From a paper:
Earlier studies have shown that the interaction between Ski and SMAD4 is critical for Ski’s disruption of the R-SMAD/SMAD4 complex. Therefore, to rationalize the SnoN complex-stabilization results described above at a molecular-mechanistic level, we crystallized a complex between the SAND domain of SnoN (T238-S356) and the MH2 domain of SMAD4 (I314-Q549). The complex crystallizes as trimers of SnoN-SMAD4 heterodimers, where SnoN interacts with SMAD4 in either an “open” or a “closed” binding mode. A striking structural feature is the strand complementation observed between SnoN β-strand β5 and the edge strand of the SMAD4 MH2 central β-sheet. These interactions include parallel β-backbone hydrogen bonds between the conserved strand β5 and adjacent loop regions (residue Arg314-Trp318) in SnoN and the edge β-strand (residues 424–430) of SMAD4. The interactions also include binding of SnoN Trp318 in a hydrophobic cleft in SMAD4 lined by Leu414, Ile429, Ile435 and His427. To further strengthen the SnoN-SMAD4 heterodimer interface, His427 offers a side-chain hydrogen bond to Trp318, and Arg314 in SnoN forms an ionic interaction with Asp424 in SMAD4. Beyond these common consensus interactions, the closed state contains additional hydrogen bonds between SnoN (residues Lys313, Lys324 and His330) and SMAD4. In contrast, the open conformation of our SnoN-SMAD4 structure can be superposed on the SMAD3-SMAD4 heterotrimer without significant steric hindrance between SMAD3 and SnoN. In contrast, when overlaying the structures of the closed SnoN-SMAD4 state and SMAD3-SMAD4, we note significant overlap between SnoN and SMAD3. Thus, based on these structural, evolutionary and biochemical considerations, we suggest that the open SnoN-SMAD4 conformation represents the biologically and functionally more relevant binding mode.
TGF-β signaling converges to a set of intracellular SMAD proteins that further transfers the signal to changes in transcription. Furthermore, there are direct modulators of TGF-β signaling and the most studied of these modulators are Ski and SnoN, which although sharing 37% sequence identity, have individual essential roles in embryo development and the differentiation of adult stem cells. Ski and SnoN have similar domain architectures featuring an unstructured N-terminal region with an R-SMAD binding site; a Dachshund-homology domain and a SMAD4-binding SAND domain; and, at their end, an extended, unstructured C-terminal tail2829. SnoN and Ski bind to promoter-bound SMAD transcription factors such as the R-SMAD/Co-SMAD heteromer, which in turn recruits co-repressors such as HDAC, NCoR1 or Sin3A to the promoter site.
Residue numbers in the entry:
A (entry chain A): 319 to 459, 491 to 541
B (entry chain B): 259 to 354
The structure:
């Protein structure tokens, strides 16, 4: 159904850099890297982007983005990441929180170079969604929270931990937030 | 003179000195932990760390077999003359 299967916003620390990259439903695999072709379509390059508030440190980091990552939408809306870069990437995924037995949002998931890891399951998201809503309703008789089930965030190069010099992802020199549109349509139906 | 420093960031971190002279067989100890002074084969170096993971971090997809993807030059050599030279030598050492 949806026109774009996700859309991706690039940030350097707490400032969005560049425009939001929308990914057409006919481009199930989208590469996000450190090079410079501005085309659009199935590749979102970050090498070329300007930022008036850029620092030496952010510049340094941008060098390691390199081949970056692929984000692949598999069949029934499941999302995989493949880390083409030669530096690891760090991810926020409730699915990975679950798979590893951690409380939601209470871990960061380092993905290692060459790795190909599954970071979201549409059916699970939809189930968790239906279920939490149906219960909270019937108890009476996390909208901002349910929303977060349909979103991944990832930092190239540097992780953020308690546990790390930097505490949140907006303190990392170059990261992205990825809104998954089928998940968001489903939650829209659920909320009605 | 000919050995250069290297590093990895898997399941921890470790810095070492790589001597291309000694890398004569796949299993040849050519890298020394700058902390413990032990000599490691590349694959075993990639498994060698004195720090333990935060256990707030979860590590996905790691394999020592893929050491070639994880081993880099020391950040000391960054934004320096020698960055670009050492990478090709390192890349050459990955081919073998
Ligand atoms: Ni060890
Ligand atoms: Ni030790």
């Amino acid at each position: 159904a949806p026109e774009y299967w996700c859309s991706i916003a690039y940030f350097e620390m707490d400032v969005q850099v560049g425009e939001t990259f929308k990914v057409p439903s006919s481009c199930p695999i989208v590469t996000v890297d450190g090079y410079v072709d501005p085309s659009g379509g199935d590749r979102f390059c970050l090498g070329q982007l300007s930022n008036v508030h850029r620092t030496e440190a952010i510049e340094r980091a941008r060098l390691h983005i390199g081949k970056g990552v692929q984000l692949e939408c598999k069949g029934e809306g499941d999302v995989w990441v493949r880390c083409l870069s030669d530096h690891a990437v760090f991810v926020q995924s409730y699915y990975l929180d679950r798979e590893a037995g951690r409380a939601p949002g209470d871990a960061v998931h380092k993905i290692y170079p060459s790795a190909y890891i599954k970071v979201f399951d549409l059916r699970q998201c939809h189930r968790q969604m239906q279920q939490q809503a149906a219960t909270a309703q019937a108890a009476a008789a996390g909208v901002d929270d349910l929303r977060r089930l349909c979103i991944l965030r990832m930092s190239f190069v540097k992780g953020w931990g308690p546990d790390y010099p930097r505490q949140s992802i907006k303190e990392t020199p170059c990261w992205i937030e990825i809104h998954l549109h089928r998940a968001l349509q489903l939650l829209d139906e659920v909320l009605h | 003179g000919s050995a250069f420093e290297v590093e990895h960031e898997c399941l921890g971190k470790c810095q070492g000195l790589f001597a291309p002279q000694f890398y004569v067989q796949p299993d040849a100890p050519c890298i020394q932990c700058l902390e413990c002074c032990g000599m490691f084969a590349p694959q075993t170096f990639v498994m060698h760390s004195h720090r333990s993971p935060d256990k707030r971090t979860c590590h996905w997809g790691f394999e020592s077999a893929k050491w070639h993807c994880y081993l880099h030059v020391n950040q000391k050599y960054l934004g320096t003359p020698e960055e670009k030279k050492l990478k090709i030598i390192l890349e050459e050492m990955k081919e073998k």
